[PDB]
């Protein structure tokens, strides 16, 4: 399979939203381990990851007035990772900062279209709801654990000059990298190969090997913090596994967990059925620059984290293909339900031009899928 006649930068632009929006570039970050009070959007159910974009459409006057006054301040709201969605129970969350905004007042109907981005993880202290229905959370800022090298303590001063290794053009290169980077492992109780399992650079390379299978077309971050978050936003896992990935403080533990999920979880089944295989990791492909899965908003303000796959099975197609509000310009969508339990699993996308490639793909919503370890 190959991507021909499709601009992979289009889905990342969120063109279905409308005309060019006012942009904001002034970032705002809070001191690590501080208690701030941030407003919560009521209808938002999604679990946000730092560096991830959240597209929104707000029609309610309490939602609209909230964002209107939010733009005049730090442009930041709280996105809660609800453990219990029906009981509104949430223990953690991510701050989302608005970077693009557009207000519509045509026909006297007020609509607010925003593009926000995940910034900081936090722990919930209390959730008090205000008169306008809008909640305000008491939030304790979770910190990002930056860790030095495992050898940064034991490494002898004489073997310090061997820390920087020459350019990487290759198993022989990685064999040499391990022996030089972890040379002072002999001063401790563990082997160099053990230290490799906690080395951010090696772990990122192992993940890059499987991320290259999904996107066969080097546009990933260098910082292990930013890389682990980019990988987390792509992994189509259950809400419980996502809240655990979001709980992790270190990039190394995050990268390790992501590798475990990528090796172990290779099958995607219907969450309601658990008796219907929708697709496998072999079909996952990145039709966007962000990866094989991104959040998009529907015409009613409902956010769907859509995973793009080449082939999907055991799905029934209901309705006729429509290009209205299409998240992949040039494709038409058709609702696809599980053939067993009729659950809305996602949509089949169909090219409108014969010169396009792929001619057909599937966008599956994360909330409808469940990763299963096959045996």
């Amino acid at each position: 399979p190959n991507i021909i006649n499709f601009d992979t930068s289009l889905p990342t632009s969120h063109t279905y939203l409308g005309a060019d929006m006012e942009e904001f570039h002034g970032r705002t970050l809070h001191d690590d381990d501080s208690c701030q009070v941030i407003p919560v959007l009521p209808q938002v159910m999604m679990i946000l990851i730092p560096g991830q974009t959240l597209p929104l459409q707000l029609f309610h006057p309490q939602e609209v007035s909230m964002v209107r006054n939010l733009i005049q301040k730090d442009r930041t709201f709280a996105v809660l990772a609800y453990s219990n969605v029906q009981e509104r129970e949430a223990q953690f969350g991510t701050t989302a900062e608005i970077y693009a905004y557009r207000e519509e007042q045509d026909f006297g109907i007020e609509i607010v279209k925003v593009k926000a981005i995940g910034r900081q993880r936090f722990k919930v202290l209390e959730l008090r709801t205000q008169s306008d229905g809008i909640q305000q959370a008491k939030v304790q800022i979770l910190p990002e654990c930056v860790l030095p090298s495992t050898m940064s303590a034991v490494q002898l001063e004489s073997l310090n000059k061997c820390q920087i290794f020459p350019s990487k053009p290759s198993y022989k290169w990685w064999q040499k990298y391990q022996k030089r980077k972890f040379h002072c492992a002999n001063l401790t109780s563990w082997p160099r190969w053990l230290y490799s399992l906690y080395d951010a650079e090696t772990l990122m390379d192992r993940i890059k090997k499987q991320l290259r299978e999904w996107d066969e077309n080097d546009s990933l971050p260098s910082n292990p913090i930013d890389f682990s978050y980019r990988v987390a936003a792509c992994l189509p896992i259950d809400d419980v596994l996502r809240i655990q990935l979001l709980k992790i403080g270190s990039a190394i533990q995050r990268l390790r967990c992501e590798l475990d999920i990528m090796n172990k979880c290779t099958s995607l089944c219907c969450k309601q059925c658990q008796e219907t295989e929708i697709t496998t990791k072999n079909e996952i492909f990145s039709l966007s620059l962000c990866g094989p899965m991104a959040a998009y908003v529907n015409p009613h303000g409902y956010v769907h984290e859509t995973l793009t796959v080449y082939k999907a099975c055991n799905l029934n197609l209901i309705g006729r293909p429509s290009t209205e509000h299409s998240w992949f310009p040039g494709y038409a969508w058709t609702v696809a339900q599980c053939k067993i339990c009729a659950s809305h699993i996602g949509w089949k996308f169909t090219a409108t031009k014969k010169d396009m490639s792929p001619q057909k793909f599937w966008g599956l919503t994360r909330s409808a899928l469940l990763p299963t370890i096959p045996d």
Binding site: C145, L147, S152, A153, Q155, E157, L159, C162, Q163, S189
Partner: protein, 1110 residues
């Protein structure tokens, strides 16, 4: 617990830096050695090194450099610590008093900054205008050395090059010029920059060289007249200057990685280079101007961290992986060669250790060093005996010193008794020769002999008590039993003799040429032992009962019993002794089972003022008095030799460093003055007792890397996991040298470009001879990771159990490994059982007769069946890698490399594990230990200790969460934690081994003790002078590069013990409003004498530190 006391038992031994200069005086050449937190100052002499001063610092020394500014008569010392405490020090001596004063000081840390990959670099320019510091990527810090910059104020110049490998200041330049090696996308390069003193910025350097060797790592600034720089890499060495470029790639350095260097002479014509393999080279700069460079191989030294050429061809080799050394470079007739003059002990890196017992006086055996430097170090405290002479003479049953010359005060004879026999040896300096004493009989076994009053010699034997004259040299008088019955036990002094026949004690008296029998009373039960030592005539006389099993003191010459203490038990006593210890008279008594009972005594009263009993050994003790300095001491001869001495009017028993000494006597020969004679079953040794009790370390070189150790008492040996490096051979692997695993008595194997390979072995080293009895080689690519020695299930055998992993370069996580059960029976190792697991066995621990093993992320528990197989009982799939495993009862403490501590409970009625609590904090962790069911100790980055406890307790979330209750910056990297007592307010003992060779002790305190010592520390911090003026609280604060919190729950015993070294008025300043608790909650004003007693007892919980200075 929540309150801990951490103290050093052995200071760090590894060397991280060494410099030469003129610090102590402009006329003295000094050697300054940095041992992490300590600075040793020596004066280089024609003989050897002279220790003059050793100072401690509240920091890990990261830069140590000597410099001479204009106006200064001698050198100053710049020190920068890992926590960025910079300082300028001056050595000041006035007569016998030495002081290290702080000329300048300050913290040079930046608010933001990415610490460089090749760490801190501190350099000083030849003109001594500034100190250049490379602490962070992209910055170069400059501290001007102006006389008035006392706060070490500095400025930062921006460096475009972000990855600098090494940087030096060049010689003979118009202005301060740095030369550095750096790396960028297009390769590794060399570059220079002038430091504009006015503009405080960089200016274009005199020269630059792009695309230098990919592995170039060292910059050497060559002094005038040549100047320029020498760049050392992996396969080549280059020279650079404005117009000149020299390049050599000698074969001699082809298989070497050079790691250290040193200039031999001021003009920079010769340099010393050291490689990771211990080779020592000489780099020669050949003049025609500079024409070429030449490398010569001198020889082998210890693996060098640093080299320093002293004077007279003497070089100091500073080692981290092996013993440091002083080597003499004896190089026309021969090639240049190196010869070792002196070796200095280095215990580090301590990668593992165990405690042998083995009374609480135990041995500590470590797995020290790496590669060729690898070894076991057996560390024990106690009194050392220098042996001067050995005589092979078996069956000695007694020893007595004699002076066969009335005109001389020195002893010249040694009389030894044997079964039914007596021999006499004469001493003429160091010439012992057997002779015959005219008047003494060889026919009988002597019970006592020696010098008696009126220039005579007595010889009490089973037959008679022969008085012999000195000048005539004949038997002047003799005493025999009135009914010819043999004497059972005999005692004597200079004026009186008390022989005991069965149960009738006859009290004779020594008179000129006569033995007048005064009394002959018969005691109730038989007489086992007696003593008439005067405290010269003795009015009192001790006696032991044969039938009654009691110790009674009788009067003389009245025989009336003044005291009759019924000892009790069934074991009859062996010896009795009356002696004065610190003007307080005591009467020790040894039992037939190595039990030393001690009671007090009065010269006129004769009553027992003590009821204490200390267990000496298994074999009966022979008490013998000897004078040490101006006072008298007692040597206890049992299955374990001991020395009894009074300390603060309370009896103290110190262990002697000898295997078995059954008999001893004090000898003061002309050739052997103030010496003693020790005797065993087959040998007579003449030795001198060591002036002061020091650590006795025995090195067992393995010539390969020891990794793990375990003690098997039943087999009387140690099981040691070790590895050796082998290179791929042309004739398709072969070892680089003979090592412990290739020179074993017996050996087994698991099966029948120059690329390195790790061959893993299990060694069985004998505990007395330390010889490699056996070496089992593991499979190819098999990595031995864990080792235990234990009994499992209902099986009486003791096994050596090893946990392995299969290591393939193409596989990141280990997919296979095994547990091999070995038995060391007779002389060989036998594989009893083998168990294949699907992962790496990182840890193993004997858990209540079962085997607890951690494979990958799983904690598996195995049962040992009667079919001699490991059968799985239960598993625990953790979300963390089970790296660390510690157990206490039915509790398990699992840990991973990222400080993820998890607590498990084995549920016996359920057969599975129940997770009790967890604390996940992301930080690097190197070791864990369980203090009690509630508290857990660990070592985390950077060089810190921590304690966490199970809270816890109202809610389930409180119960399932460990609270951090203790934080402390130790300054060392702990590799191993182990419970153990090395020595005879502190509960429990946990020992730790570090990378630098430091051994420490962590013990528990009560809340009252922790509070008193915590106030005392804060008061001590206001009195103690700190080198570099660093705050103790800053030093001890828990530290990582991102965060710093104060120390809690830990008392620094090294600081508390320094109270003993302060002035008397300063001791009262420290204890001014302290509240001393005397076990009642009723605090009072504490006095200096109260805290002297408290701190003095705290020093007795660990090994004492040697005095550095002569």
């Amino acid at each position: 617990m929540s309150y801990n006391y951490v103290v050093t038992a052995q200071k760090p031994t590894a060397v991280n830096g060494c410099v030469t200069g003129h610090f102590t005086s402009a006329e003295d050449l000094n050697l300054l050695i940095a041992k992490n937190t300590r600075l040793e100052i020596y004066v280089v002499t024609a003989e050897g090194l002279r220790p003059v001063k050793e100072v401690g610092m509240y920091g890990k020394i990261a830069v140590m450099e000597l410099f001479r500014p204009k106006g200064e008569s001698k050198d100053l010392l710049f020190i920068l610590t890992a926590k960025y405490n910079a300082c300028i020090l001056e050595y000041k001596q006035s007569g016998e008093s030495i002081d290290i004063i702080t000329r300048a000081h300050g913290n040079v840390q930046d608010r933001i900054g990415r610490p460089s990959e090749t760490g801190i670099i501190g350099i000083i320019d030849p003109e001594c205008r500034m100190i250049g510091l490379r602490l962070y990527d992209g910055l170069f810090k400059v501290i001007p050395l102006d006389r008035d910059n006392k706060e070490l104020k500095a400025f930062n110049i921006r460096l475009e090059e972000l990855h600098v490998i090494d940087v030096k200041f060049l010689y003979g330049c118009q202005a301060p010029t740095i030369c550095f090696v750096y790396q960028d996308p297009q390769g590794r390069h060399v570059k220079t920059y002038e430091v504009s003193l006015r503009e405080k910025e960089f200016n274009k350097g005199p020269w630059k060289q792009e695309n230098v060797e990919a592995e170039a790592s060292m910059v050497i600034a060559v002094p005038e007249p040549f100047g320029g720089a020498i760049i050392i890499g992996q396969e080549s060495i280059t020279y650079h200057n404005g117009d000149k470029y020299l390049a050599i790639a000698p074969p001699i350095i082809k298989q070497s990685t050079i790691v250290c260097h040193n200039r031999v002479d001021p003009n920079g014509s010769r340099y010393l280079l050291g490689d990771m393999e211990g080779r020592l080279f000489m780099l020669l700069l050949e003049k025609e101007t500079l024409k070429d460079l030449r490398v010569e191989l001198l020889g082998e030294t210890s693996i060098a961290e640093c080299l320093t050429y002293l004077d007279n061809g003497v070089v100091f080799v500073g080692s981290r992986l092996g013993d440091s050394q002083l080597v003499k470079l004896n190089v026309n007739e021969q090639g240049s060669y190196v010869v070792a003059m002196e070796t200095f002990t280095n215990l580090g890196p301590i990668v593992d250790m165990c405690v042998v017992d083995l009374q609480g006086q135990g041995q500590l055996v470590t797995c020290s060093g790496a590669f060729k430097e690898g070894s076991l170090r057996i560390i024990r405290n106690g009194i050392g005996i220098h042996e001067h002479a050995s005589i092979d003479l078996p069956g000695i049953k007694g020893l007595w010193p004699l002076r066969s010359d009335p005109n001389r005060e020195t002893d010249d004879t040694l009389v030894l008794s044997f079964v039914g026999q007596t021999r006499v040896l004469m001493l003429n300096g160091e010439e012992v020769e057997e002779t015959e004493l005219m008047g003494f009989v060889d026919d009988q076994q002597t019970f006592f002999c020696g010098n008696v009053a009126h220039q005579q010699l007595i010889q009490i034997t089973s037959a008679s008590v022969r008085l012999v004259s000195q000048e005539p040299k004949a038997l002047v008088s003799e005493w025999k039993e009135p009914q010819a019955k043999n004497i059972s036990v005999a005692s004597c002094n200079s004026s009186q003799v008390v022989v005991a026949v069965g149960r009738a004690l006859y009290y004779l008296q020594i008179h000129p040429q006569e033995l007048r029998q005064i009394s002959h009373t018969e005691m109730e039960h038989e007489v086992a032992c007696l003593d008439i030592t005067p405290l010269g005539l003795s009015p009192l006389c001790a006696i032991g009962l044969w039938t009654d099993i009691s110790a009674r003191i009788l009067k003389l010459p009245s025989f009336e019993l003044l005291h009759k203490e019924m000892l009790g038990g069934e074991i009859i006593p062996r010896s009795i002794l009356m002696t004065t210890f610190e003007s307080s008279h005591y009467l020790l008594c040894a039992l037939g089972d190595g039990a030393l009972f001690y009671f007090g005594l009065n010269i006129e009263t004769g009553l027992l003022s003590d009821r204490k009993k200390v267990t000496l050994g298994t074999q009966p003790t022979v008490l013998r008095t000897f004078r040490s300095l101006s006072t008298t001491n007692v040597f206890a001869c049992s299955d374990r030799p001991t020395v009894i001495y009074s300390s603060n009017h309370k009896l103290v028993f110190s262990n002697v460093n000898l295997k078995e000494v059954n008999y001893m006597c004090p000898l003061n020969s002309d050739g052997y003055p103030d010496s003693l004679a020790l005797a065993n079953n087959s040998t007579l040794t003449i030795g001198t007792i060591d002036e002061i009790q020091k650590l006795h370390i025995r090195t067992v070189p393995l010539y390969e890397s020891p990794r793990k150790i375990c003690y098997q008492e039943v087999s009387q040996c140690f099981g040691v996991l070790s590895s050796r490096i082998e290179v791929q051979d042309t004739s398709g692997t072969t070892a680089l040298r003979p090592s412990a695993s290739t020179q074993a008595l017996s050996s087994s194997v698991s099966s029948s470009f120059g690329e390195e390979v790790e061959v893993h072995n299990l060694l069985i080293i004998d505990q007395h001879t330390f010889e490699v009895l056996h070496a089992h080689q593991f499979l190819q690519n098999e990595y031995a990771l864990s080792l235990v020695s234990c009994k499992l299930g209902k099986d009486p055998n003791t096994y050596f159990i090893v946990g392995t992993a299969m290591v393939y370069p193409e596989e990141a996580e280990p997919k296979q490994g095994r547990i091999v059960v070995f038995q060391y029976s007779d002389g060989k190792l036998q594989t009893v059982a083998e168990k294949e697991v699907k992962g790496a066995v990182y840890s193993m621990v004997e858990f209540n007769g079962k085997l607890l093993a951690s494979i990958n992320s799983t904690v598996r528990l195995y049962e040992w069946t009667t079919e001699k197989e490991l059968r799985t009982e239960c598993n625990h799939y953790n979300n963390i890698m089970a790296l660390y495993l510690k157990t206490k009862g039915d509790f398990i403490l699992v840990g991973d490399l990222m400080r993820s501590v998890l607590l498990l409970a084995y549920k016996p009625m359920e057969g599975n594990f129940e997770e009790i609590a967890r604390d996940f904090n992301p930080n690097w962790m190197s070791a864990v230990e369980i203090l009690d069911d509630d508290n857990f100790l660990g070592a985390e980055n950077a060089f810190n200790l921590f304690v966490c406890q199970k809270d816890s307790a109202t809610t389930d979330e409180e119960r399932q969460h460990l609270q951090e209750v203790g934080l402390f910056h130790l300054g060392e990297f702990v590799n191993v934690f182990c419970h153990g007592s090395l020595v005879m307010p502190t509960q429990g003992s946990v020992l730790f081994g570090t990378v630098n060779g430091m051994i420490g002790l962590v013990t528990s305190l009560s809340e009252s003790w922790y509070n008193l010592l915590l106030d005392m520390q804060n008061r001590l911090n206001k009195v103690i002078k700190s080198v570099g003026k660093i705050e103790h609280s800053f030093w001890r604060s828990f530290h990582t590069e991102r965060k710093t919190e104060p120390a809690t729950g830990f008392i620094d015993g090294d600081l508390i013990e320094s109270f003993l070294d302060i002035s008397r008025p300063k001791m009262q300043e420290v204890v001014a409003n302290l509240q001393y608790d005397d076990g009642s909650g009723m605090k009072r004003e504490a006095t200096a004498d109260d805290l002297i007693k408290v701190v003095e007892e705290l020093t007795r919980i660990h090994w004492s530190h040697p005095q550095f200075e002569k």
